[PDB]
Amino acid sequence: SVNNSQLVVSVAGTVEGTNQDISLKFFEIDLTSRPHKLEKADLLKAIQEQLIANVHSNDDYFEVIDFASDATITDRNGKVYFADKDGSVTLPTQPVQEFLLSGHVRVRPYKEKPIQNQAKSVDVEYTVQFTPLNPDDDTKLLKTLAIGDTITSQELLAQAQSILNKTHPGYTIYERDSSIVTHDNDIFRTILPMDQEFTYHVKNREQAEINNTDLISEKYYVLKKGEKPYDPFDRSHLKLFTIKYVDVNTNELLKSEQLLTASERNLDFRDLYDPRDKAKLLYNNLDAFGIMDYTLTGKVEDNHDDTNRIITVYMGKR
Amino acid sequence: SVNNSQLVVSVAGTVEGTNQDISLKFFEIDLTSRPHKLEKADLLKAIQEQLIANVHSNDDYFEVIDFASDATITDRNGKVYFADKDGSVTLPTQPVQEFLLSGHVRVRPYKEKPIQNQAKSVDVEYTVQFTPLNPDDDTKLLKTLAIGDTITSQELLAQAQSILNKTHPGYTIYERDSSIVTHDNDIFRTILPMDQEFTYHVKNREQAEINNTDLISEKYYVLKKGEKPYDPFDRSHLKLFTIKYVDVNTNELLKSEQLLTASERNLDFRDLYDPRDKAKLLYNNLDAFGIMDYTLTGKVEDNHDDTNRIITVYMGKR
Description:
The structure holds 2 chains of a larger assembly.
Chain A: E1 6-9, E2 12-15, E3 21-23, E4 27-30, E5 36-39, H1 40-52, E6 62-67, E7 72-74, E8 80-81, E9 88-91, E10 98-102, E11 104-109, E12 122-132, E13 140-141, E14 151-152, H2 153-166, E15 172-183, E16 190-191, E17 199-200, E18 212-223, E19 239-247, E20 253-261, E21 295-302, E22 310-316
Parallel strand pairs in A: 1-10, 2-11, 12-18, 19-22
Antiparallel strand pairs in A: 1-4, 2-3, 5-9, 6-11, 7-8, 7-10, 12-13, 14-17, 15-16, 15-18, 19-20, 21-22
PDB class: blood clotting
Keywords: human plasmin, streptokinase, blood clotting
Entry title: complex of the catalytic domain of human plasmin and streptokinase
């Protein structure tokens, strides 16, 4: 791997209360430039981010406390490295190898404490995204509420539509895909109910006079208005094809198969080493099926019957 | 390759007059979205960039005149694809395969035509880079000359030093590395004499209206003042080691070898698969040399004699 010293942080959480093991995916930290030194803190910080990585729901959030009496950084030979008073660690970046941060981390379900110094108002931000439900082509301010204030899928659903027209009109918000609220960079973002209405009542937070801010990021699926999905369950748009590989010498059917395909263009040859030849119908080897040494004769018989598409791919020995 | 049709631009050059063929490095073009349409000018433009890629000397420059009646784009079946009056081409990027643009391009050594509409003055720019001659750590404007005026390696070496101390002092321009002059995005930049003094007399160019500009990019090697280079021809800073792999049952010297290494830190076992274990002295397989089935015993007698560093690596059979 990278000819540079990196620290493999491979841990497990142990949950406060129920001592249950929470898997955490190993990740590498790169020890580039400045013997390099790392603050314990930062390490924990990195660990936080990864625990938060790809959290669907809100109670999938966990908090990194400190290291168990498990944590331990070791080099290839078992030499343990220790934390000084700065809680930092100093690792020899030069001899060049990879270090191993093993052990457990103390964790607990994310449960914020009370906000002593309440914040005044939270300027609500909004930035939406759009995605076409099928074949096709193709962020601001608002309500600067306080803390108890709330908003709903309606209003949001609204401002969304408003913008939908403001850009490419004749389109429509088919459905809402995702919707999250970030409260002033606070790592823990409020994920909102996916498929169903809801109402977000701001939150809380210590005063960051000027004020605190929130942000709503959303994503809706759009339709060109008066259209439809893609392949929800359709095989009407696909073309059936029956392919017959035959011995050009013995006129014996070596093999045959039927396939449905999005286009007739795919009526072409396929190289089983070449990834671009995935949707291409006609083979040229038949080795994948035990049929040895046959080669594309370069002659194909297309009955052209659009209702009954039978292609006869001629093949001979080497 | 990239699961997406791309255009392979494999062409050769044909210098005007001397109908000689100058070679060019093929490069692929990603045909991502919009049957895609390519304009002659873009391809001719791509090609240009390439022809000028890493041109050492000022006279290694070539001008791309235009395709020859050779140019032929073609899909895997020889189907040629024709341009139109817009000189643009439209390739079916859907079936997914790689088209091939081949043939020749008409070029000639870079010779510029007279600047009819003379440029007023050229506000010369300057931006220097700095690199350390050995182990260690560690863009404005000026003389707004006109057209025949000049500047020397001295004045530059000056602005060089001036800034050298302005940033990190106690350092010195050990030597000049590179120096180029970009005249208003003009692809053909002026490469100035590498190792030796010189005098650049602006250039020329059509009035950009507003004032035309020049830019000088330099790069020098700097020393920490009162130092030297790195490993010019040294071997004193290196440490001689003598390693002896011994069978731990017969005590037969299986191998032994002498090496010089930059640091004692390298006295460590090396895995012949792991590319970090490159500067390491102690093997562990020995298979590399024909001695099969041996593995580090994990025991090593280090004579500790510093003048004579002999190491005995005990190895054992499975």
